[PDB]
Amino acid sequence: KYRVRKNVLHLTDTEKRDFVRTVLILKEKGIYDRYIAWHGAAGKFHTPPGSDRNAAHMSSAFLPWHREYLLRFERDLQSINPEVTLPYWEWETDAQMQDPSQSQIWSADFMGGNGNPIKDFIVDTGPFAAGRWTTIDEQGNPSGGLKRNFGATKEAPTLPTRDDVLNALKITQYDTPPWDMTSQNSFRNQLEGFINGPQLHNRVHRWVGGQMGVVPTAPNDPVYFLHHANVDRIWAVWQIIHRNQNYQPMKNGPFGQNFRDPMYPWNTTPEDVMNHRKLGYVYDIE
Amino acid sequence: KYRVRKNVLHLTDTEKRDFVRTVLILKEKGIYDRYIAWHGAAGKFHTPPGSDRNAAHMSSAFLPWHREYLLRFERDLQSINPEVTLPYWEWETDAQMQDPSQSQIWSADFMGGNGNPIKDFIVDTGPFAAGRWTTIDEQGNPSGGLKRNFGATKEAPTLPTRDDVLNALKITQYDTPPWDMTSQNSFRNQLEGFINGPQLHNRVHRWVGGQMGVVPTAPNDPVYFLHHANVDRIWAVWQIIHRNQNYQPMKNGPFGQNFRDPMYPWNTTPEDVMNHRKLGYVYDIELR
Ligand SMILES: [Cu+2]
Ligand SMILES: [Cu+2]
Ligand SMILES: [Cu+2]
Numbered sequence: 171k172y173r174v175r176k177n178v179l180h181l182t183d184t185e186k187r188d189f190v191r192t193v194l195i196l197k198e199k200g201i202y203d204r205y206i207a208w209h210g211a212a213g214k215f216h217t218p219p220g221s222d223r224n225a226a227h228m229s230s231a232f233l234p235w236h237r238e239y240l241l242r243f244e245r246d247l248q249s250i251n252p253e254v255t256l257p258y259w260e261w262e263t264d265a266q267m268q269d270p271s272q273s274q275i276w277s278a279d280f281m282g283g284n285g286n287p288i289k290d291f292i293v294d295t296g297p298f299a300a301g302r303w304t305t306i307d308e309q310g311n312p313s314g315g316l317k318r319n320f321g322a323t324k325e326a327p328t329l330p331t332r333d334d335v336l337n338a339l340k341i342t343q344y345d346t347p348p349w350d351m352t353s354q355n356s357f358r359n360q361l362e363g364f365i366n367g368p369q370l371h372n373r374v375h376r377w378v379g380g381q382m383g384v385v386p387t388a389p390n391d392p393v394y395f396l397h398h399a400n401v402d403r404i405w406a407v408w409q410i411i412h413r414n415q416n417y418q419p420m421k422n423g424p425f426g427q428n429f430r431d432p433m434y435p436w437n438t439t440p441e442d443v444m445n446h447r448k449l450g451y452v453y454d455i456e
Numbered sequence: 457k458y459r460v461r462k463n464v465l466h467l468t469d470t471e472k473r474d475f476v477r478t479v480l481i482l483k484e485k486g487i488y489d490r491y492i493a494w495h496g497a498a499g500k501f502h503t504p505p506g507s508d509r510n511a512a513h514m515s516s517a518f519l520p521w522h523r524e525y526l527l528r529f530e531r532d533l534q535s536i537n538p539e540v541t542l543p544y545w546e547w548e549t550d551a552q553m554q555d556p557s558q559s560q561i562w563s564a565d566f567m568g569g570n571g572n573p574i575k576d577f578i579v580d581t582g583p584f585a586a587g588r589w590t591t592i593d594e595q596g597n598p599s600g601g602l603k604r605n606f607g608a609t610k611e612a613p614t615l616p617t618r619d620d621v622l623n624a625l626k627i628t629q630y631d632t633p634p635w636d637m638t639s640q641n642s643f644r645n646q647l648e649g650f651i652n653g654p655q656l657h658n659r660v661h662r663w664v665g666g667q668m669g670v671v672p673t674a675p676n677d678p679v680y681f682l683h684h685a686n687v688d689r690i691w692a693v694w695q696i697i698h699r700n701q702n703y704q705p706m707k708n709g710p711f712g713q714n715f716r717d718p719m720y721p722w723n724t725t726p727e728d729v730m731n732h733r734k735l736g737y738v739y740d741i742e743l744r
């Protein structure tokens with residue numbers, strides 16, 4: 171109830187500038203690379219082995235994993251500059267924009283712009299432009315040059331809308347068997363975006379394109395975290411509406427997916443991050 | 457300074473039995489594969505990106521990373537059976553046998569035997585034989601079963617010796633610049649095995665063969681942990697003998713290799729694990 175995560179569009183110029191600079195310090199120090207690797211490591215831990223489920227996606231842990239993931243990243247931000255909190259990209263308001271590329275999140279003092287088509291959609295503006303920000307491939311080796319390409323795939327031409335979010339918030343159960351991509355009437359899976367997908371969380375990823383478009387490499391782009399803060403916010407809201415609803419599966423799901431299972435690559439459990447206000451933060455909607 | 461790690465040679469038949477049982481329960485529960493995946497992930501975290509050093513291997517954190525790795529694994533053992541500690545494979549003693557492959561470590565009540573050359577060196581004896589124990593590959597998906605092929609390469613025809621260990625215990629610097637495979641007069645690099653490699657710790661990997669011969673997939677074989685318990689024992693002896701001498705680099709090394717850097721995949725630092733007794737355990741040779 172003390173660290174405030176604000177809407178990106180409500181940040182001051184000094185807030186935008188300070189957040190971007192802590193991120194760059196985290197990159198220069200080698201700490202930011204830890205999160206790219208954690209995320210790529212979580213994607214090849216199948217629960218159980220041979221399953222399409224993994225520790226961080228395509229199953230019930232999707233939401234608590236990224237909550238814990240954002241929680242650590244913001245802790246690393248705060249250790250450099252204690253004023254800094256993780257902002258959230260309310261992409262569902264930007265979807266009403268006649269041209270969402272022109273939103274202030276993409277301004278040159280924050281995330282920088284869309285990909286440049288003549289340079290193969292290499293990002294050449296803002297603080298994470300090529301030559302200012304070096305990316306990493308799946309196998310931990312340099313791959314030179316952030317890329318984006320907004321709305322360029324047929325399956326995700328538009329950002330998810332407010333009605334998408336309101337509809338997801340209606341779903342009555344956190345998750346349902348078989349706790350994977352096929353789960354029906356499941357808030358986790360609906361928000362993750364596999365209900366007639368890509369929608370919501372999956373749809374944003376494909377919309378940004380670039381590394382943001384392939385899940386193992388998506389945290390190469392700083393907007394990933396701003397994206398997932400919003401996903402964490404929607405979850406926070408859902409938990410306050412369906413108060414008498416808790417995590418599922420409680421047990422008898424694959425190991426790593428149950429309420430008290432450690433979430434690879436950590437020992438942190440879903441129960442550990444159920445209450446975000448006890449984790450030290452709130453969203454600027456109270 | 458209380459949990460005692462025993463030489464595999466001095467283990468009772470019931471200690472061999474309970475330890476195997478515990479490893480199999482960790483496997484069944486999903487816990488063992490976290491260790492496998494942790495080791496692969498460490499191998500992809502290069503320090504820095506593009507370097508041939510990684511978080512767990514080929515740089516200075518080699519030694520503390522595995523100490524933490526084994527300490528975690530041992531705690532997971534304790535949680536299933538509080539009497540079980542991690543034993544160590546004193547491979548320098550095995551190398552003295554005319555034929556090290558007859559060592560009791562490889563018996564059918566413990567680790568099981570060599571691979572079957574008719575079955576592409578799949579292990580078909582012991583509690584980790586194919587069809588009782590499932591390996592996973594670098595992508596977290598089942599592979600065919602444990603493999604071993606003892607001493608089959610030209611570079612590692614034999615296990616490291618007593619003199620190889622004593623010769624390493626002589627070196628006074630923990631590590632040297634450039635904190636990597638090329639470090640000279642480096643305890644870390646000598647013990648890891650890159651001085652006229654493969655020696656010592658790398659030699660053991662390459663002599664076992666199978667999954668043990670491929671550092672990323674090595675923990676699919678539970679003897680990996682008995683191996684590293686021995687490496688950790690040797691470093692611990694080095695610390696008792698060179699008490700003035702500390703970890704290096706203190707600072708100015710690549711991030712993830714300095715004394716107070718987190719060791720990916722964890723936040724544990726080398727400082728956190730320097731004193732093995734303050735982690736709760738000792739090796740039997742300390743107790744006489
Ligand atoms: Cu996979
Ligand atoms: Cu993710
Ligand atoms: Cu995501």
Ligand SMILES: [Cu+2]
Pocket residue numbers: 309310311499500501502
């Ligand atoms: Cu690599």
Ligand SMILES: [Cu+2]
Pocket residue numbers: 495512513522
């Ligand atoms: Cu290793």
Ligand SMILES: [Cu+2]
Pocket residue numbers: 657661674684
């Ligand atoms: Cu090893």
